[PDB]
Amino acid sequence: APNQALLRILKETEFKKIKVLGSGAFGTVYKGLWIPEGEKVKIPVAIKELREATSPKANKEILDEAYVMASVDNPHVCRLLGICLTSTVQLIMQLMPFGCLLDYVREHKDNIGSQYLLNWCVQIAKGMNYLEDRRLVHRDLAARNVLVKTPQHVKITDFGLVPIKWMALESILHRIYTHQSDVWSYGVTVWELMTFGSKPYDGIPASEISSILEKGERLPQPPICTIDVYMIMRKCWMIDADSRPKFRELIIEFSKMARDPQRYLVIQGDERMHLPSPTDSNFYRALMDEEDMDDVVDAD
Amino acid sequence: QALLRILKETEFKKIKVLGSGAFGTVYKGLWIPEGEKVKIPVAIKELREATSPKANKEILDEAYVMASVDNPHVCRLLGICLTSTVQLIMQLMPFGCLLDYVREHKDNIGSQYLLNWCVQIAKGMNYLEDRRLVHRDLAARNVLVKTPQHVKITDFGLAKLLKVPIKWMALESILHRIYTHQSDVWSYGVTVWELMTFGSKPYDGIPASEISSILEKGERLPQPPICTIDVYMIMRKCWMIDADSRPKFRELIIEFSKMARDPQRYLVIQGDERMHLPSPTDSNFYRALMDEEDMDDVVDAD
Ligand SMILES: Nc1ncnc2c1ncn2[C@@H]1O[C@H](COP(=O)(O)OP(=O)(O)NP(=O)(O)O)[C@@H](O)[C@H]1O
Ligand SMILES: Nc1ncnc2c1ncn2[C@@H]1O[C@H](COP(=O)(O)OP(=O)(O)NP(=O)(O)O)[C@@H](O)[C@H]1O
Ligand SMILES: O=C(Nc1nccs1)[C@@H](c1ccccc1)N1Cc2ccccc2C1=O
Ligand SMILES: [Mg+2]
Ligand SMILES: [Mg+2]
């Protein structure tokens, strides 16, 4: 039973859209402003407007999901904050000024250190492991669905509710979605990071992806990945869903790797790239990230 | 140590003036982290008088203390920039100071908000006392609104870093510039008075030079129309000539907490029934958007 107090019902008068941030299969994301009743302040939020207008009875099913998505509580998962049931439904969550991780790593190619990359792999695995523990399946994990709270803190979004090149073969062939097909997409998500945001299977029609996968072909080793990192990615893309790693294991493996980061990723000038000092880390949190969180795995 | 960030002029920029006081000017600002493209809103206080390189060592010693203050009801210094001026960086509070907030919501604030504000301010002041720090400039203008449910004392120590708030000051502070936790308690009483009157000016139109003589005559700020006698009694006890005869912040937490539990027994406010602490729903929203900080549960009515 989801605590429905966690899902605020918004009135259309309480908020305004002010900028488009992007779009995807299900809707259009806006940066918006929430103006609390009787106050003078404008509070930035992110708003997703769904693609299709809905009936009151369809709105019921949307509301049931919304109650569930408002109920998650983990430092590496975003929760839904509110909902507006206009003709076409609008959804409100926290605005991330750093955007999604996909855009972040593209803007910082190739000037992201190994420490950051491997730590993001841990945080995304923790977030996913939590979803598994709540018995939620993501169905759409990708770098565009990992949000950057601060560069040291990423959070999974848009879970629980096609992107062929992120999908496990059984999902492509049978529309089966499990925690283990989420693990496949984890693999692709890790590939996106390690390539600083390249497009998976670029140039290949979605049409042919299932065929290519059956031939045993896969995304290529990114040039910064040592063979153990690559091996992990390949294990995520095994035909047999049960042979793939569990998110629990992925937390452990990547945490180990984060302890000796230059041993597992090879990045030119890695020595010189920023590893966040305590001073910088504390500033970011005091400024824009006060939530309770874990400690980041640092190099021994 | 690692609590005070030293910034360079290149990574921040002042935008708009928010206000000025005795020691400097406050700006709505932007923090532009090196190599990032995001602009993070901050507040910047530039002190009035330029700095020596030797007066820099003084400022930093104190800044490091201000950055060490970790409590949900006190603001900490986040960063500093030392040029010809001294610039101090802290979290921007969009809601502004408590003084402004009570004026703007004048007569539309419930007893539960007012009494809980008194609890929170008392907790934050008690924390400074436990750390052996004196504020020296407590007033409603130096309490900030994080959300309407969450207020935080600001600008402590800044008075030690360097026009005189006579009408907030204890008598021994006026006459001898003695500042103690017990002189902070005097100012706390004044602060509470500011809130209970929805932001009236204390001793309005009475010359500052006359204040010490007024106080010596046993005269004090008047009972706000919404305060019952027990609440006015606490305030009057904060303004006792004998400092050790004033309440301790510790006690003030206990008293106002007691009162927040039965708020209509202690404040008489017209329309108070249609004003209430936020639903959990509404409180959840506010916290997710504005206040991820941990903080004690707000005292609710029995
Ligand atoms: N809370 C948010 N804060 C800041 N930016 C966001 C937020 N949510 C989404 N965005 C950005 O808006 C874009 C569109 O989001 P979305 O509508 O969910 O499509 P997508 O996830 O990128 N692709 P799809 O998998 O088809 O849904 C995202 O890629 C982000 O760049
Ligand atoms: N972090 C902050 N966020 C938003 N507004 C602030 C902040 N700090 C101060 N202000 C406002 O900036 C203005 C100036 O504050 P300040 O320079 O400290 O003088 P003052 O507190 O009003 N009087 P005093 O400090 O006692 O001399 C006031 O309007 C404050 O409400
Ligand atoms: O709202 C979400 N994304 C946003 N991006 C910007 C503003 S909102 C997303 C989400 C899922 C899980 C956690 C947080 C958000 N939802 C919720 C939800 C409830 C009912 C029906 C569809 C959706 C949906 O897509
Ligand atoms: Mg998305
Ligand atoms: Mg001030």
Curated annotation (Swiss-Prot), chain A:
Changing residue 22 to D: Found in a lung cancer sample. Ubiquitously expressed. Isoform 2 is also expressed in ovarian cancers. Changing residue 72 to M: Found in a lung cancer sample. The active site is at 140 (proton acceptor). The modification N6-(2-hydroxyisobutyryl)lysine is found at residue 48. Changing residue 161 to M: Found in a lung cancer sample. There is a cross-link at residues 19, 40, 57, 60, 215, 246, 256 (Glycyl lysine isopeptide (Lys-Gly) (interchain with G-Cter in ubiquitin)). Changing residue 22 to S: Found in a lung cancer sample; somatic mutation; strongly increased kinase activity; constitutively activated kinase with higher levels of basal autophosphorylation; more sensitive to gefitinib than wild-type. Changing residue 9 to A: Abolishes phosphorylation. ATP binds at residues 21-29, 48, 93-94, 158. Phosphorylated on Tyr residues in response to EGF. Dephosphorylation by PTPRJ prevents endocytosis and stabilizes the receptor at the plasma membrane. Dephosphorylated by PTPN1 and PTPN2. Changing residue 136 to V: Found in a lung cancer sample; more sensitive to gefitinib than wild-type. The modification Phosphotyrosine is found at residue 284. Belongs to the protein kinase superfamily. Tyr protein kinase family. EGF receptor subfamily. It is linked to Lung cancer: A common malignancy affecting tissues of the lung. The most common form of lung cancer is non-small cell lung cancer (NSCLC) that can be divided into 3 major histologic subtypes: squamous cell carcinoma, adenocarcinoma, and large cell lung cancer. NSCLC is often diagnosed at an advanced stage and has a poor prognosis. Neonatal nephrocutaneous inflammatory syndrome: An autosomal recessive disorder characterized by intrauterine growth retardation, premature birth, fragile skin, recurrent skin infections and sepsis, failure to thrive, nephrocalcinosis, and nephromegaly with tubular dysfunction. Some patients have chronic diarrhea, and necrotizing enterocolitis. Receptor tyrosine kinase binding ligands of the EGF family and activating several signaling cascades to convert extracellular cues into appropriate cellular responses. Known ligands include EGF, TGFA/TGF-alpha, AREG, epigen/EPGN, BTC/betacellulin, epiregulin/EREG and HBEGF/heparin-binding EGF. Ligand binding triggers receptor homo- and/or heterodimerization and autophosphorylation on key cytoplasmic residues. The phosphorylated receptor recruits adapter proteins like GRB2 which in turn activates complex downstream signaling cascades. Isoform 2 may act as an antagonist of EGF action. This is Epidermal growth factor receptor. The chain holds residues 698 to 1014 of 1210 of the full protein.
